[model samples]
Target: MSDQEAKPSTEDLGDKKEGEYIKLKVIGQDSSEIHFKVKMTTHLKKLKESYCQRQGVPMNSLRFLFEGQRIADNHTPKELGMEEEDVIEVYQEQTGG
Candidate 1:
């Protein structure tokens, strides 16, 4: 048998990555708070899409901020230098239609 280990798909969001995780305080609308562990390689766009889907809001109606700076969807946690415990704030840009 050939010796080759298949790489796990990055789409496995529920699985924990070894030595790679960040805890963030996700503040939704109405002052709701949720603490979550996320992979460093997770793309910002995916998170945004998930939030929009969950809340039944349009994706364009939300904005994400890290340390008071707007975060682009192309950037990952690793690329942004996010630490073990970072604060990610979500805001509603406008009322969803």
Candidate 2:
């Protein structure tokens, strides 16, 4: 049987259908890689906070980008209108030259 046919659709889940989770890839300034999942309702600030915790950096120094465009501090994944299977790039911003 095909996986599609075997899987329950959102309709079947009904109210149980929670916000979709997205896989985000974070690259630190030192070239460290971290991968994690976050719900669609997760805000960009929260994502950065999580990444910062993982990388041992301060949350205020991090930034996010989608399709090479920097995301504003006030924007969240949902606020930015990201859809399923979207790839978000997270990185830390360096201060000074």
Candidate 3:
């Protein structure tokens, strides 16, 4: 089996890098946590969508907070200066009756 003629050997060169992405924790009111790994440069909208989907909640009804401040959908981890294992709190709108 002379497999030395493979030209696709360099296709898988760029593996996952440590600093490229960071791990984050999303916590909710029920004391539940969801972990997601996202790139520092990636917008947080995707994360928000996934979190809402898993909790069966509407996107507009929820708010994402980092460092005790609300984060917009256009915000990114790098923009917020987030770190690894950082926690993002999720809160739902409280409409008073």
Best of the candidates, lDDT: 3
* C-alpha local distance difference test of each model: 0.67, 0.62, 0.69
Candidate 2 C-alpha lDDT tens digits along 16-44: 45654565455545465555554566567
- 53-72: candidate 3 lDDT, tens digit per residue: 88787666677776678777
Q: Which stretches of candidate 1 lie over 4 Å from their true place?
A: 1-19, 93-97
| Candidate 2 displacement at residue 7 in angstroms | 30
Candidate 3 Cα misplacement greater than 4 A, ranges: 1-19, 94-97
Q: Give the TM-score of candidate 2.
A: 0.54
lDDT of 2 at 1: 50
User: How many collisions per candidate?
Assistant: 0, 0, 0
What's the lDDT for residue 33 in model 3?
Answer: 68
